Amino acid sequence: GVDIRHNKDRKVRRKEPKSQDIYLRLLVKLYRFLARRTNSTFNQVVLKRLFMSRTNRPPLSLSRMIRKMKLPGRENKTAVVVGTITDDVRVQEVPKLKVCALRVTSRARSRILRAGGKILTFDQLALDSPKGCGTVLLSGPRKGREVYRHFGKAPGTPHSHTKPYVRSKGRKFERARGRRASRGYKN
């Protein structure tokens, strides 16, 4: 007998996409080969993002992509996102962008192309930059989800600002005892 613990032997991580999308599986095959047969760590990151779930591949708005592309030294670089690129109607000027995405919204696609931009899929990105040279790997806001407002410390604990689960919002719904000093306590 040996003195070890076996509760952490099996690392919990995606070794493949749980999706049955045959097109996603094809470009997983392409980037499984690229990650193995190159020393590019860019291919390793892209490959493991391809396995990720939809909640782990948040959409990237056009405004956020433009703002990251506008940073110094990123001219003539390809914006790579492993997910959906989304139109942001809050912006009025779209510059010229070279973009690779898993998926682009129709309105966002029209805006990028009309501004002289270029849109690539991940198969075309492999031919353009097999090692991912001259690319900016972007990601949508991972915690930009309603669930994360409810996560954290319990709402009925001091110094916790987490949203409780309520069927309705109003003066009659969970605004009394434990929420104000007049009604017992507040914390």
Binding footprint of Mg ion on the chain (CB under 5 A)? 6
| Residue 172 binding partner per list Mg ion, other proteins, RNA, none, with a CB distance cut-off of 5 to 8 Å that depends on partner kind | other proteins
Half-sphere exposure of 160 (CA within 13 A, CB side): 17
Q: By CB under 7 A, what part of segment 57-96 binds RNA?
A: 58-59, 61-64, 67-68, 70-74, 77, 83-84, 86-91, 93
Q: What is the CA radius of gyration of the chain?
A: 22
Binding to RNA by CB under 7 A, coded x per residue (else -) over 118-147, reads -------------xxxxxxxxxxxxxxxxx
Encoding tokens for residue 61? 């708005």
What whole-number distance in Å separates Cα of residue 80 and Cα of residue 102? 9
Name the residues that contact other proteins, by CB under 8 A. 89-90, 92, 150, 154-157, 164-167, 171-180, 183-184, 187
Are 89 and 109 a contacting pair, CB within 8 Å?
no
Decide if residue 161 touches RNA (CB under 7 A).
yes
Residue in 96, 115, 124, 177 binding RNA, rule: CB under 7 A: 177
Q: Cβ of residue 152: shortest distance to other proteins, in angstroms? A: 11
Strands (E), the chain: 60-61, 78-86, 98-104, 118-120, 135-138
Which 3 state secondary structure label does DSSP give 139? coil
Decide if residue 115 touches RNA (CB under 7 A).
no
- Count Cβ atoms within 10 A of the Cβ of residue 57 and give its class: 0-12 exposed, 13-18 middle, 19 or more buried: buried
Q: Cβ of residue 180: shortest distance to RNA, in angstroms? A: 7
Decide if residue 42 touches RNA (CB under 7 A).
yes
| Residue 105 binding partner per list other proteins, RNA, Mg ion, none, with a CB distance cut-off of 5 to 8 Å that depends on partner kind | RNA
